[PDB]
Amino acid sequence: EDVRKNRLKPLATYCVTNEMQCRENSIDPTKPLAERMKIENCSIIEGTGNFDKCVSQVESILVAPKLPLPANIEAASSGFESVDQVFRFASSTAPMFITGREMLASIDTLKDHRLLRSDFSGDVEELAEAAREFCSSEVIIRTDGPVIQLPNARGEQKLNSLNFDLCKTMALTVSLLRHMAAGENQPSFIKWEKSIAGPDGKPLADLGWQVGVILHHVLFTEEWGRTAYEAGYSHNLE
Amino acid sequence: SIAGPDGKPLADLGWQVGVILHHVLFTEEWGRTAYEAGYSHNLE
Amino acid sequence: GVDADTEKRINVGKTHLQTLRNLETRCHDSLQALVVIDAGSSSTRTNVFLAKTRSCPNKGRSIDPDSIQLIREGKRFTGLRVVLEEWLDTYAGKDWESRPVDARLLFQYVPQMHEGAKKLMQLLEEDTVAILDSQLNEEQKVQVKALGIPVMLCSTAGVRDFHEWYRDALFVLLRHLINNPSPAHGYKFFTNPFWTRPITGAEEGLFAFITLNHLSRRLGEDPARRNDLAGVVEVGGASAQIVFQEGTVLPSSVRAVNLQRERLLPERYPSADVVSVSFMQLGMA
Amino acid sequence: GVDADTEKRINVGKTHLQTLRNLETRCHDSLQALVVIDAGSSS
Amino acid sequence: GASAQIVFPLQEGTVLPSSVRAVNLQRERLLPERYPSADVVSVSFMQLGMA
After folding, report:
1. Other Cβ atoms closer than 10 A to B24
2. Do residues A111 and A100 lie in contact, with contact meaning Cβ atoms separated by under 8 Å?
3. C204 is a catalytic site residue
């Protein structure tokens, strides 16, 4: 019930057309912080278990919203307001890599339950067929943690703080791949990776912004030599 | 010896100061050999 | 006999000078450590890296890009967002979130923000040294300490700007803590406003693109076709990024991000015009 | 009184950051030694 | 007649929100590097033009 532990806090804090765009997305800036993120006339959330309805909602709210958020144009950003407009005007045939802890887990969970084939092709309908069966699963209270019972005896797994919201990420993967296919140009291959292996067989470093930050300073031979070697640690010395 | 602004000479006459300056004055080359490479160059 | 003794003795003396003359002219390789502090909305953790430096005469010192390898990623400590939030609860009152509080009045509690940042920095220094002492051997430590360790503390998308002065001043204090480390360990940690700086979602996506192409051996000096680079779709905790045909007619409202012009890649590396987009609304939280 | 206490306390905190921001931007002077060995016919 | 323009030198060390961008004359190839660096608030409005 905490204000800091609330997931709507980064959206509530940030919220000419910016004031209008926030209000239409239910985040009224004029309203106080307490009722800004508090859902009006709601007390209980009940799971209906429908993947196709989840996909359409993720599409209408997150992926392709009719009234999107400002999405400002900085020195690093291109300028696109939403995902749907990116693959519509700027689609490329260049290979794609889908990263993210919750994103990778969405594909792995379907693979381990035999619903998704061992060969990771990246076909939207093959991914949607496997997720439709998994997300329509029953929940029963057990002696050693709650279990996710798959329909027509496909399998079972323990329910945790990272497994219940996994189906929303599965809908995000389906919706995002649907926009990639709809565009003029389609990528060479669609792959899911946690880390890229080097020439030795083992990865040198993990995926993220980490290596990019090093390189963008390191690659500039003259500037790196002046700050890291000419000045060095000897700079901050009295 | 030539006296400086304080009244006392900074260094004695000869080739000594000239050898220092002819390496020192070249800002880029001096920074590459004396600071970029430095003493850390001859290290196994 | 006497001829075999004389010819070998001369050869040993000749090869001795040849080896000595080579040491002066040839390039020397030295091991260097690189520290990157991953400061986020959830946690602030250290990342220790290793690289090979090439010391050539009249050319200077440069890091081999392919030699960059991560050794160990540190433990998850309290985020920078919480550090300032606790500073606002104690020195401005819990009402700060809704009730308007003057920023000028909080300028008197600056050394109190320094003490709060000191508490986190000492733990990050302790964790880094623990990795360096356990992962490096004795000969490696001689090269690592003598050169100096550059630190790159970056606060990613998720940490709020606060719209005042709090976050900007905290970074000035953080840099001072890094530039003044414990002399006990011997590891010369240092930084500057260029390395230690707050980063945005769009910037994070661009660095993630440079990382992916470097590890896949795609990003290099020799061009294959504009270099053949692979795109990335990273859906993180706070923000999601999409960074990725040829000479396409693009609208005026949207600009194609050139990594060379934006000072992210040098002129010697092939030109890369990419579509860089970041959305906070698609991030996990 | 309370106004003189608050205004001075803010000023000390403001001048603390001003000095810290200056150290990062301003140039630093360090003493260095240079050795020249005069090798001749006599000594 | 058609459109109104307002171009002026930017305040030294402004807030500069990510919604807007500062137009550098040297970076936009309008002025050479030998001339002093200048960042301006360059805006044009069709709705404010005389006609």
Report:
1. 13
2. no
3. yes
User: Hey, is the C-beta of A237 within 8 angstroms of any chain D C-beta?
Assistant: yes
Largest CA distance in chain A: 74
Closest-CA residue of B relative to D35 is B20
Residue C48 three-state SS = strand
- Tell me the C-alpha distance between A211 and C212, whole Å: 9
Experiment type: X-ray
**Å resolution of this model?**
3.1
C157: CATH: 3.30.420.530
Rg over CA atoms, chain B: 15
CB A229, CB C64: distance < 8 Å: no
Beta carbons within 10 angstroms of residue A223's beta carbon: 14
Catalytic residue among C24, C86, C204, C267: C204
CA A88 to chain centre: 20
Q: d(Cα C54, Cα C51) in Å, to the nearest integer?
A: 10
Q: How many CB atoms lie within 10 A of CB C119?
A: 11
Chain A from 195 to 234: CB within 8 A of any D CB: 234
Q: In a 10 Å sphere around its CB, with 0-12 CB exposed, 13-18 middle and 19+ buried, how is residue D37 labelled?
A: exposed
- Domain of residue C155, residue span: 1-199
Q: Which residue of D has its CA nearest to B19?
A: D36
